[PDB]
Write a structure and sequence with these properties.
Length: 511
């Protein structure tokens, strides 16, 4: 007898037994056609040592209604044997072969925040732990725990999200029936949250009633033909007192003598000083002439003498001594290098008024008629020229060792809550800037300039802010704002604003 063709269809649509199919009944079908195969012939196959049988139907179709999933999972290859006859009774066997895959795995992917506990939802169908097991440990040492309430919870470890080691955690559960479930847990980075900070500072305002200023050149070192005198039309201009505001030196190599002149600011001040205010005590002029060498001073001292009045009418005499270093430089054909240079020293005098102490301090030189100009301590003057600057002082409360200050820490609750640190910790300040915008920069633990003062903010959040502006430049709105950036151990960053209200109190010791 002629053998026919036995074919076996795919064992399920994808030709693989999976974890769900494992617990089910599966139909197996095929064909048996040609040769001496007839409708009615016996079809047999052994799958995992159980025999399944059927007959060939019309058109050569055969099917087996219920093969166990568990049998096909145990045996991925088998023969189908069809037994046929011809008209004369000669037996023949036709043989087909089937193979399929067995993949009893299923996966579950999650993306979850570090350092938190999470309920795992939408687990694959049939998911569970083998009998007795309430906890499995993940590759990173976390756990998936089965609770009283039937829920699966994952304790996500904290990870270094910046390093060279992947933060995709994993665990495989294996069941007795051969199923596995792989849970992949992509651990997501956490970040600190910086919270805005508020601070304030009030600068004091007080008015002082002052006498006229008398300024005198009182001493000097080195120089030839040194004279000091009350200024005149020709030499220095006039002032309202007989104190000696002019000094001249040198043997003139061209026309006149070099020197200094100081014209007090008596008429603009109108007998009042303000506290915490840059005040010009007068105009300093440097007259630079060519003089033969050895003729010039190297320093000179000026006494600035005035009286301050108190609410009971008692007067305190005050003397501020101002020292200037002078460099009458060798003249060459280089104009810039030929300039003569004057440096004022940062002196002060402290006086008492109504039981409080106040300190008059030299700030330096400022351009004439430019109250908001840069203040310098050295000035440079060309040969055959005179420069003029305002000599600026400031009167402060106390011993003058410091400016009005406020301190704090940006990690504290400064009116809106403490900064949140996140799960990674090791948070530090890594950037600070005046304005709204900050990145990690090189200003942390440095002094930086605000609108009205300077800030030092350190990496641990501690800051000191001090008001450098004069009271006259502090409007009633006045706010400073500095942005800072914090960063955690693997680089996550957050910014917030340190806002400082800078007030002025205009009221006095009235009650
Ligand atoms: Ca399948
Ligand atoms: Ca099942
Ligand atoms: Ca036949
Ligand atoms: Ca087999
Ligand atoms: Ca197959
Ligand atoms: Ca296949
Ligand atoms: Ca990592
Ligand atoms: Ca992290
Ligand atoms: Ca404060
Ligand atoms: Ca005067
Ligand atoms: Ca005079
Ligand atoms: Ca004078
Ligand atoms: Ca000169
Ligand atoms: Ca010179
Ligand atoms: Ca803060
Ligand atoms: Ca982080």
């Amino acid at each position: 007898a002629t053998a026919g063709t036995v074919t076996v269809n795919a064992i399920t649509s994808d030709d693989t037994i999976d974890g769900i199919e494992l617990g089910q009944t599966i139909s197996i079908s095929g064909k048996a056609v040609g040769g001496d195969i007839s409708v009615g012939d016996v079809v047999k196959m052994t799958i995992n040592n159980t025999e399944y049988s059927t007959t060939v139907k019309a058109g050569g179709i055969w099917m087996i209604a219920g093969v166990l999933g568990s049998d096909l999972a145990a045996d991925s290859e088998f023969d189908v044997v069809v037994t046929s006859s011809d008209a004369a009774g000669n037996k023949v066997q036709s043989i087909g072969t089937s193979t399929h895959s067995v993949d009893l795995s299923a996966e579950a992917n999650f993306s979850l925040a570090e350092g938190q506990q999470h309920v795992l939802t939408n687990l694959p169908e049939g998911f569970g732990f083998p009998d007795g097991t309430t906890e499995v440990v993940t590759n990173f040492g976390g756990t998936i725990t089965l609770g009283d309430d039937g829920e699966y919870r994952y304790d996500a470890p904290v990870r270094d999200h910046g390093d060279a080691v992947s933060d995709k955690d994993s665990v495989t559960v294996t069941l007795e029936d051969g199923r596995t479930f792989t849970v992949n847990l992509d651990i997501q980075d956490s970040a600190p949250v910086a919270v805005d900070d508020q601070d304030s500072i009030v600068v004091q305002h007080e008015e002082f009633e002052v006498s006229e200023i008398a300024a005198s050149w009182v001493s000097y070192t080195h120089g030839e033909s040194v004279t000091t005198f009350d200024g005149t039309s020709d030499l220095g201009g006039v002032d309202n007192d007989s104190a000696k505001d002019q000094i001249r030196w040198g043997n003139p190599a061209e026309s006149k003598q070099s020197g200094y002149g100081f014209i007090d600011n008596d008429s603009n001040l109108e007998g009042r000083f303000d506290l915490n205010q840059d005040i010009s005590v007068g105009t300093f002029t440097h007259y630079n002439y060519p003089v033969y060498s050895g003729g010039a001073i190297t320093s000179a001292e000026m006494s600035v003498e005035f009286s301050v009045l108190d609410h009971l009418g008692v007067s305190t005499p005050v003397t501020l001594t101002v020292n200037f270093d002078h460099n009458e430089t060798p003249n060459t054909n280089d104009v810039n290098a030929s300039r003569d240079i004057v440096t004022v020293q940062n002196t002060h005098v402290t006086f008492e008024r109504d039981g409080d102490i106040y300190t008059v301090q030299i700030v330096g030189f400022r351009e004439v008629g430019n109250p908001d100009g840069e203040v310098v301590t050295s000035i440079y003057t060309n040969e055959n020229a005179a420069t003029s600057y305002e000599l600026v002082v400031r009167v402060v409360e106390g011993d003058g060792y410091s400016l009005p200050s406020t301190e704090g820490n940006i990690f504290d609750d400064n009116g809106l809550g403490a900064d949140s640190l996140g799960a990674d910790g090791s948070v530090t300040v890594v950037g600070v800037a005046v304005g709204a915008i900050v990145s990690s920069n090189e200003s942390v633990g440095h002094s930086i300039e605000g609108q009205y003062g300077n800030l030092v903010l350190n990496s641990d959040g501690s800051y000191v802010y001090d008001v450098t502006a004069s009271v006259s430049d502090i409007p009633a709105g006045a706010t400073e704002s500095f942005a800072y950036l914090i960063q955690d151990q693997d680089g996550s960053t957050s910014s917030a604003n340190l806002s400082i209200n800078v007030g002025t109190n205009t009221a006095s010791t009235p009650d």
